[PDB]
Design a protein around this nucleic acid. Structure first.
Ligand SMILES: [Zn+2]
Ligand SMILES: [Zn+2]
Ligand SMILES: [Zn+2]
Lengths: 50, 50, 1123, 64, 45
DNA sequence: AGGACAGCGTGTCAGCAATA
RNA sequence: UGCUGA
C-alpha cells in the first residue's frame, strides 16, 4: 500500500550505524559506487497467511 | 517501514552515501544540539513567612 | 433526541484503540442523517409518488380512421439496476462500484403497462418498456441498500457512505435543494412591474404556487386592477392567459351571485368600494351573456379551446373543465374548495390594496420552501410519460388511419414504435443540468439544477447535500437584496457558510440541526379534529362577525374561521398534540397564528402546514421539555432562549438545543470562531473545501479526473466537539505545526509564510495527485473495422521497452513527456500507433483498468490509466490556518538559521505578526496556546464556540494550563537567533497550530509563451496554458504603456509580437484587395486597373486585412491612401 | 497514513515508539504518562505521536 | 503471459487481441493489469 | 406642439472541465 | 454552462 516514492523517502530517514569517517564522498556522477564510498542493504519481505 | 497483507511483497536495494546535514536533514547526526546561557537568580531581599 | 449522545468535549483515545481498523457492525447514523433529505425524497418519488403521478395522466383518447381509441397507463415500475438482458452471467445485480471503474450510468428499468381500448368494450393490456431512469445510491431501488459496513467493504464502497447522489457517466451528480416560493399558500406581493401586464393593472397581487402530490406545480397570480376588479393570470405551457375573476368563480361553483358576493365581502361587510367592485366583477363581465354555470363553462371553453389543444369531439363545457383541472389550484380535488381558496386569495388582495396588510417579502425564508431531488425527478417523469403517450399516438394517427380491426395485430409493434423515447431525454437533465420542458415545471429556473459532487475533501462533499441555492438567475442582478442575511434564517441557514465571491448570499447552507421534511401523512382526521377544538366549518354560523374571526387554512384547504378568542387556545392545543405525538398531528405540523391588531401587520389567520418540503429545526419546548420541531414561519411568533438563565417566566416559550445550533456543519469545525472577525470565519468555510487532505479510502476503484491526497494527516489537538460526533478523523485534512509569531526573515511579510527546510525534508505536508485518464478508443475511428485494440506489432523500435506487449505502460513505470503511452493496432490493416505522453510533468503509472461493454462482450477498446504525480510543498504553494489566514510559501529557511528556543526546539512555521492587527483573528492566538497545552499534557481541548465567557476567559484557562506545565502564562518562550547566536531582546509567542494545505499550486498556475499556435482568423497567439498559450494584453493596458510616452515599446510589443504582416496595395487606387500574383516572373498586377508597377508593400496587421475582408462582405469599400 | 519515522521539527526518531505507545495505552496509562515513559520530552515530539491517525489500518482492508 | 486480476474474483486472466474482455469464473468487465518484477530507481529525497 | 414611448446601452482580471 | 484564483 505504501507508494514507491514514499517508501524511498521513509527509507532515507532511517539512521545507519556505519561510522562516516571510514568512508568518502561519491564523486559527482558516480552512480555505481565502490567499497570506498557506498554501503548496500536489501529488504525482501512477503506476507503469507500462517 | 510498512504494513503488508497476504500476497503483498516488498523487494528493493538501498544505497547509502556520505553527506552533511546541510544539503538534506537525513544526513544530520543529532536530534538537537542547542545551548542556553546559564540563568542567574538573586534575592535582593530575604523572603520569608509563607 | 437524535442530538443526544453528542460528545461533551472531544477525545483522542479513539485513535490508539485496540479496535481502530475493525469495520463496525452498523453505519455511523449522524453522517447518514446528512443526505437523508436527498434519499427519503427519492424513495417516495420512485415508489409511492410514481403511482400517484401515473394516476393523474388523463387517458389519451384520439381519432384513428373513423375510430376513437383510449390509452391509459395503469402502473409504472422502476426496477433496481441489473445486467442488461440475460446475455451476461453469474450476477444479475449491478453495484455502483462499477460504472465508476467503467464510465456508465447506474440506471434502472422503467416499464409501464398501458391499456388500449376501442370505445371501451374491446381492450387488451400490453406491458411496454418505457426506458431507463437513473438511480440514487442508497435509495431502495439500489443494490447497496441494507448492507452493513463490513459487507459494504467487499463491494468497493466507503463503509461510511451515504449516497444521496446519482452516477451519470461515473460523475456523481448531486442535485441540490433549490429555493421555491412556497406551496399551497397565498403570498401577497407588491411588484411594480405588474402594471405593465395590461391597461389598468396595479402593482398589487397575491401569487400562489400550487403543488399536487409532488408531481405537478403551477403558478397562478390574482392581480388588482384600478377599477376595484381582480384578474387571474394562469400559465399553460409557458403562455400567460388572463381571465377576469367571476368567469372563474361562476364556473367553479353553481351558486347564486348573492352567496358568492357574500363570500368575497366576508370580513369587510361595511366597506362600500368593495361591495361595489364585487358587483362589477359578477355583472360587468358575466351578466354579459352567461348566467348559468354551463354557459360560463361553454364561453370559457370556446375562447381557450384553441390553445388548450383539447380533443375536437369534446364539448366546450368539457374543455373548460380541462383548464380548471390543469391550470388553476392543482392541489385541490373539489371545485367547491378551489372556489373558497380563490376567494381567500382575493379577500387578501383587497386588504393589500387598501393598505390593511403588509406585503410578504418573497426573499424571507418565512415565505420559502425547498425543491428536493424527488420533486424534480417525479415532475420530469410524469411530464415525459405524458409526452410518450402523445408521441406514440402521433405515430398512430400518422401511419395509416386504416381499419384498426386487423390492426390490433400490430398494436404492440405500434406502441414500441414510440416507446424508444423515454431514455436519453432523462440523462440530459442529469448530465447537463438544464431543463428542456414544454412547461418549466413551475420552477422559474432551467439550468444548474444538478451539479458535479467532487470529493476533493470530505468537507467539500458533505456540503453539497446541505447547500440551498436561492436561484441561478439572481447571479445577474443590479440590486443586492436577496443577499441580505435576514434575521428570519436563524437556525435554518448558517450566517458564515456562504461562498465569498459572485455566489455570496445566493448559495447558503443549512445549520447542523435544521432538516427538510420528507414524510407524507394522511391528514384527513385533522379537519374533523379542528372542528372539535372550536373551528366552525366554511359553511356557516361563525358565531361572530367574520372580522373578529381568524381564517383557518390547512394545506391550501380553508377549514374556516376559528373564533378570535378561541384561536390562541386552539393553537396551543395543536402544538401540545404535535409535541406529545397525540391525535394524528404529524410531529412536524407548523401551527401558525398570525395575530390581528388594527395595524397593517401580516394578514391575520391560523395556518397549519404539513407539506413535505418545508425546513424544520429542533428546539427544547419549555413547559413540556419534549423537543419540539419549529418551522421558518412558526419561529417568528415565539421566544427561544439560547443559554439558560436567559429563560424567563412569561417570555421564553421555547429554548434552543445547543448554543452553536445556529452554525453550519463546516462552521462548527472552525476552532474558537467567536474570537475571530466574521469575514474571516466565512473565509474559513471556503478554504476548508479547497484543502489537500485524505479524500477517501478506496483507491484503485474510483477513476476520477483529479484526486489530491495528503500523505500523513493528523488530527487537530484543539478541535470542536462536533468534529468528534461526525467522525472527521476517518478523513483528516491537515497537520499540526509548531508556529512562532516572529518577524525574523524579511521573506514572511505581507501574507507570505516561512517553512523550516528540515521539517519539509522530514515529510511535512507531502502530497500527491491522481490523474485518471479514460482512454476509450472508439475515437480515432467511426463504425468501420476495429482500429481499436491495445497492442504492439512485434519489434516496433518506437515501443522497444516502454510498453508491455498490450500497448499499455507497465504498472509502476515512470512517465515523462515524449514517452510512449499506448499503442493501438488496426486489426485489418495491421498498423500500430504509439500515441506519446505529452504532459510536461513526471508521474508513475499506478493502475490500469480494462473495461468491457456492459454485456461482457467488449473488445479491448476502453481502458483507464491512473498516473501518480508527487506534489510536495514547493515555493508558491498556498497554506492556511483554520481561521482564514491564507499565505503562500515564500522561503524554506535552513534548519540551522531558524531561531531556536531555550528548550532546544525550533519552529517549522514562521508567521509574520502583522496579519493580526487588521484581520483580528484572535482565535489563532488562542489555538496556539490550546495546542501547546494539549501537546504538553497529552490532552485534547475543545474549541467549541460560545463555551468560554468574559468571566471564564479562554486566555485565562489556557495560560493556567501552560503555567501548570512550567511554561509561562502568556504563551511566550524566549528564543535565540540562529544566525547571530544571541538571545533576542523580545520573548516570542510560539505554539502548535493546525495547518491545511490548499489545492492551488504554482505548478498548476504558471505560463510562459514565446511563439506557438497562431489563431488562423487573426494570426495572433492562441491562448490557454495547455498549448504555448499567450497572455491577452488588453485595452486597459495599452493606455498605461502610452501614458509613459513609450510609443516604441507599445509599437514593438503589439506589432512585432502579435500580427505584423507585409501586405501589398494598389498605390494608385488604394485597395488592399486589388494586387494580384501571376501563376508561376511573379510580378504583382492590379485587377481593377491593369497596372503592374503601381503595386508596393505596406506594413499592416492581419486583423487589419481581416477587417478589410469583413467590410467587403457587405459591399462597403475601404479605400486607403498609400504614401 | 503510517507513523512518521523522524519528528519533523527536531529530527528525533519516533517511528519505533508507535507499538510501544499503543501497548502502554492498553495497559492503563494516560497519554501524558505514556508519552513520558517513551522519552518524548519536548512537545514537538509529543504532538507527533499524540495526534497520529493510523490510516494504514483502514487502507489495509480492501481486497488485494 | 500478460496477467490481469479480476475486479472482485481476483482470478488471473490472460487476454490478447481479438478476444472479449470478460473474466473467467465470473463475468465482470473490469480487470487490473498486474505488477511484474522490473527494476525502477527512486531517490530518497 | 403637450406628450407616449420603444430603444439602445455598457458591466476588472486570468485558469480548468467540457462540450456546442 | 457549473467551478475556481487575484
Ligand atoms: Zn487599381
Ligand atoms: Zn521533536
Ligand atoms: Zn473473476
Amino acid at each position: 500500500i505504501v507508494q514507491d516514492e514514499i517508501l524511498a523517502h521513509r527509507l532515507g530517514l532511517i539512521p545507519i550505524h556505519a561510522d562516516p569517517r571510514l568512508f568518502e564522498y561519491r564523486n559527482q556522477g558516480d552512480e555505481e559506487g565502490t567499497e570506498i564510498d557506498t554501503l548496500q542493504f536489501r529488504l525482501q519481505v512477503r506476507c503469507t497467511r500462517n | 517501514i510498512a504494513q503488508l497483507r497476504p500476497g503483498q511483497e516488498i523487494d528493493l536495494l538501498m544505497h547509502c552515501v556520505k553527506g552533511i546535514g546541510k544539503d538534506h536533514a537525513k544526513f544530520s547526526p543529532v536530534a538537537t544540539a542547542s545551548y542556553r546561557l546559564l540563568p542567574d537568580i538573586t534575592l535582593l531581599e530575604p523572603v520569608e513567612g509563607e | 433526541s437524535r442530538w443526544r449522545n453528542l460528545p461533551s468535549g472531544p477525545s483522542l483515545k479513539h485513535l490508539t484503540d485496540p479496535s481502530y481498523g475493525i469495520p463496525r457492525e452498523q453505519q455511523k447514523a449522524a453522517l447518514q442523517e446528512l443526505t437523508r433529505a436527498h434519499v427519503e425524497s427519492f424513495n417516495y418519488a420512485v415508489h409511492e409518488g410514481l403511482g400517484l403521478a401515473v394516476q393523474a395522466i388523463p387517458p389519451f383518447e384520439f381519432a384513428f380512421k373513423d375510430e376513437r381509441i383510449s390509452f391509459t397507463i395503469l402502473d409504472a415500475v422502476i426496477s433496481p439496476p441489473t445486467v442488461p438482458k440475460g446475455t451476461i452471467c453469474k450476477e444479475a445485480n449491478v453495484y455502483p462500484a462499477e460504472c465508476r471503474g467503467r464510465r456508465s450510468t447506474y440506471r434502472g428499468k422503467l416499464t409501464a403497462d398501458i391499456n388500449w381500448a376501442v370505445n371501451g368494450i374491446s381492450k387488451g393490456i400490453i406491458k411496454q418498456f418505457l426506458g431507463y431512469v437513473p438511480i440514487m445510491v442508497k435509495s431502495k431501488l439500489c443494490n447497496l441498500r441494507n448492507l452493513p459496513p463490513q459487507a459494504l467493504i467487499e463491494h468497493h464502497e466507503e463503509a461510511e457512505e451515504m449516497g444521496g447522489y446519482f452516477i451519470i457517466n461515473g460523475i456523481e451528480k448531486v442535485i441540490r435543494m433549490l429555493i421555491m416560493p412556497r406551496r399551497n399558500f397565498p403570498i401577497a406581493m407588491i411588484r411594480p412591474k405588474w402594471k405593465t401586464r395590461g391597461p389598468g393593472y396595479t402593482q398589487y397581487g397575491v401569487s400562489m404556487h400550487c403543488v399536487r402530490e409532488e408531481h405537478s406545480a403551477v403558478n397562478m397570480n390574482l392581480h388588482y386592477l384600478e377599477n376595484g376588479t381582480v384578474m387571474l393570470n394562469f400559465i399553460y405551457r409557458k403562455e400567460l392567459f388572463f381571465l377576469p375573476l367571476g368567469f372563474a368563480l361562476k364556473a367553479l361553483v353553481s351558486f347564486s351571485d348573492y352567496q358568492i358576493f357574500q363570500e368575497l365581502i366576508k370580513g369587510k361587510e361595511d366597506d362600500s368600494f368593495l361591495r361595489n367592485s364585487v358587483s362589477q366583477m359578477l355583472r360587468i363581465v358575466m351578466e354579459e351573456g352567461c348566467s348559468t354555470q354551463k354557459q360560463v363553462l361553454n364561453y370559457l371553453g370556446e375562447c381557450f379551446r384553441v390553445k388548450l389543444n383539447v380533443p375536437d369531439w369534446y364539448p366546450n363545457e368539457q374543455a373548460a373543465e380541462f383548464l380548471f383541472n390543469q391550470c388553476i389550484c392543482i392541489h385541490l380535488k373539489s371545485n367547491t374548495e378551489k372556489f373558497y381558496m380563490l376567494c381567500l386569495m382575493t379577500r387578501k388582495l383587497f386588504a393589500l390594496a387598501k393598505g390593511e396588510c403588509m406585503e410578504d417579502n418573497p426573499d424571507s425564508l418565512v415565505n420559502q420552501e425547498v425543491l428536493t431531488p424527488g420533486q424534480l425527478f417525479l415532475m420530469f417523469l410524469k411530464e415525459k410519460l405524458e409526452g410518450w403517450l402523445v408521441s406514440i399516438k402521433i405515430a398512430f394517427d400518422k401511419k395509416a388511419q386504416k381499419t384498426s380491426v386487423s390492426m390490433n395485430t400490430d398494436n404492440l409493434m405500434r406502441i414500441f414504435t414510440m416507446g424508444i423515447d423515454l431514455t436519453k431525454p432523462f440523462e440530459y437533465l442529469f448530465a447537463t443540468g438544464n431543463l428542456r420542458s414544454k412547461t418549466g415545471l413551475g420552477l422559474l429556473q432551467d439550468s444548474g439544477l444538478c451539479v458535479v459532487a467532487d470529493k476533493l475533501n470530505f468537507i467539500r462533499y458533505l456540503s453539497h447535500f446541505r447547500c440551498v441555492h436561492r436561484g441561478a438567475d439572481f447571479a445577474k442582478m443590479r440590486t443586492t437584496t436577496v443577499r441580505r442575511l435576514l434575521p428570519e434564517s436563524w437556525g435554518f441557514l448558517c450566517p458564515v457558510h456562504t461562498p465569498d465571491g459572485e455566489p455570496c448570499g445566493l448559495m447558503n447552507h443549512l445549520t447542523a440541526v435544521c432538516e427538510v421534511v420528507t414524510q407524507f401523512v394522511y391528514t384527513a382526521s385533522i379537519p374533523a379534529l379542528l372542528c372539535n377544538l372550536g373551528v366552525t366549518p366554511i359553511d356557516g354560523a361563525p358565531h361572530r362577525s367574520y372580522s373578529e374571526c381568524y381564517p383557518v387554512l390547512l394545506d391550501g384547504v380553508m377549514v374556516g374561521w376559528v373564533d378570535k378568542d378561541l384561536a390562541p387556545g386552539i393553537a396551543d392545543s395543536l402544538r401540545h398534540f404535535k409535541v406529545l405525538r397525540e391525535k394524528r398531528i404529524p410531529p412536524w405540523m407548523e401551527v401558525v397564528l398570525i395575530p390581528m391588531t388594527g395595524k397593517p401587520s401580516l394578514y391575520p389567520g391560523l395556518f397549519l402546514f404539513t407539506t413535505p418540503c418545508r425546513l424544520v429545526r429542533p428546539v427544547q419546548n419549555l413547559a413540556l421539555g419534549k423537543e419540539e420541531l419549529i418551522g421558518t414561519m412558526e419561529q417568528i411568533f415565539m421566544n427561544v432562549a439560547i443559554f439558560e438563565d436567559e429563560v424567563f417566566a412569561g417570555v421564553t416559550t421555547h429554548q434552543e438545543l445547543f448554543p452553536h445550533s445556529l452554525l453550519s456543519v463546516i462552521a462548527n469545525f472552525i476552532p474558537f470562531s467567536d474570537h475571530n472577525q466574521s469575514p474571516r470565519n466565512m473565509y474559513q468555510c471556503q478554504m476548508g473545501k479547497q484543502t489537500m487532505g485524505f479524500p477517501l479510502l478506496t483507491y484503485q476503484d474510483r477513476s476520477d479526473n483529479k484526486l489530491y491526497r495528503l500523505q500523513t494527516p493528523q488530527s487537530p489537538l484543539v478541535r470542536p466537539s462536533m468534529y468528534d460526533y461526525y467522525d472527521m478523523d476517518n478523513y483528516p485534512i491537515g497537520t499540526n505545526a509548531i508556529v512562532a509569531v516572529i518577524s525574523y526573515t524579511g521573506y514572511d511579510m505581507e501574507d507570505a509564510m516561512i517553512v523550516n527546510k528540515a521539517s519539509w525534508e522530514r515529510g511535512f505536508a507531502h502530497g500527491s495527485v491522481y490523474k485518471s485518464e479514460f482512454i476509450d478508443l472508439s475515437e480515432k475511428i467511426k463504425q468501420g473495422d476495429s482500429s481499436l485494440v491495445f497492442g504492439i506489432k512485434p519489434g516496433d523500435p518506437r515501443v522497444l521497452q516502454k510498453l508491455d506487449d498490450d500497448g499499455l505502460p507497465f504498472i509502476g513505470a515512470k512517465l515523462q513527456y515524449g514517452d510512449p503511452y499506448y499503442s493501438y493496432l488496426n486489426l485489418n490493416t495491421g498498423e500500430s500507433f504509439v500515441m506519446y505522453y505529452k504532459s510536461k510533468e513526471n508521474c508513475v503509472v499506478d493502475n490500469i483498468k480494462v473495461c468491457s461493454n456492459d454485456t461482457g462482450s467488449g473488445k479491448f477498446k476502453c481502458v483507464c490509466i491512473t498516473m501518480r504525480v508527487p506534489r510536495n510543498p514547493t515555493i508558491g504553494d498556498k497554506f492556511a490556518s483554520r481561521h482564514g489566514q491564507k499565505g503562500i510559501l515564500s522561503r524554506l529557511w535552513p534548519a540551522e538559521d531558524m531561531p531556536f528556543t531555550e528548550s532546544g526546539m525550533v519552529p517549522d512555521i514562521l508567521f509574520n505578526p502583522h496579519g493580526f492587527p487588521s484581520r483580528m483573528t484572535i482565535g489563532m492566538l488562542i489555538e496556539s496556546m490550546a495546542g501547546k497545552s494539549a501537546a504538553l499534557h497529552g490532552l485534547c481541548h475543545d474549541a467549541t464556540p460560545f463555551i468560554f465567557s468574559e468571566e471564564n476567559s479562554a486566555l485565562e484557562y489556557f495560560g493556567e494550563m501552560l503555567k501548570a506545565a512550567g511554561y509561562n502564562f502568556y504563551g511566550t518562550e524566549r528564543l535565540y537567533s540562529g544566525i547571530s547566536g544571541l538571545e533576542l531582546e523580545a520573548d516570542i509567542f510560539i505554539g502548535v497550530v493546525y495547518y491545511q494545505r490548499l489545492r492551488h499550486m504554482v505548478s498548476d498556475k504558471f505560463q510562459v509563451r514565446t511563439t506557438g499556435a497562431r489563431d488562423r482568423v487573426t494570426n495572433q497567439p492562441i491562448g490557454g496554458r495547455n498549448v504555448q498559450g499567450g497572455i491577452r494584453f488588453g485595452e486597459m493596458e495599452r493606455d498605461a504603456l502610452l501614458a509613459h510616452g513609450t510609443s516604441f515599446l507599445l509599437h514593438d510589443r503589439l506589432f512585432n509580437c502579435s500580427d505584423r504582416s507585409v501586405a501589398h496595395v494598389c498605390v494608385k487606387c488604394g485597395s488592399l484587395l486589388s494586387p494580384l500574383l501571376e501563376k508561376p516572373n511573379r510580378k504583382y498586377n492590379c485587377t481593377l486597373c491593369s497596372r503592374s508597377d503601381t503595386i508596393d508593400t505596406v506594413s499592416v496587421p492581419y486583423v487589419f486585412r481581416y477587417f478589410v475582408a469583413e467590410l467587403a462582405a457587405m459591399n462597403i469599400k475601404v479605400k486607403l491612401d498609400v504614401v | 497514513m503510517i507513523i512518521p519515522v523522524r519528528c519533523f521539527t527536531c529530527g528525533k526518531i519516533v517511528g519505533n515508539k508507535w507499538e510501544a505507545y499503543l501497548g502502554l495505552l492498553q495497559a492503563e496509562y494516560t497519554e501524558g504518562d505514556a508519552l513520558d515513559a517513551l522519552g518524548l520530552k519536548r512537545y514537538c515530539c509529543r504532538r507527533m505521536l499524540l495526534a497520529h491517525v493510523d490510516l494504514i489500518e483502514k487502507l489495509l482492508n480492501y481486497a488485494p | 503471459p500478460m496477467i490481469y486480476i479480476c475486479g472482485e474474483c481476483h482470478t488471473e486472466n490472460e487476454i490478447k487481441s481479438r478476444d472479449p474482455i470478460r473474466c473467467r469464473e465470473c463475468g465482470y468487465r473490469i480487470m487490473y493489469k498486474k505488477r511484474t518484477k522490473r527494476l525502477v530507481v527512486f531517490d530518497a529525497r
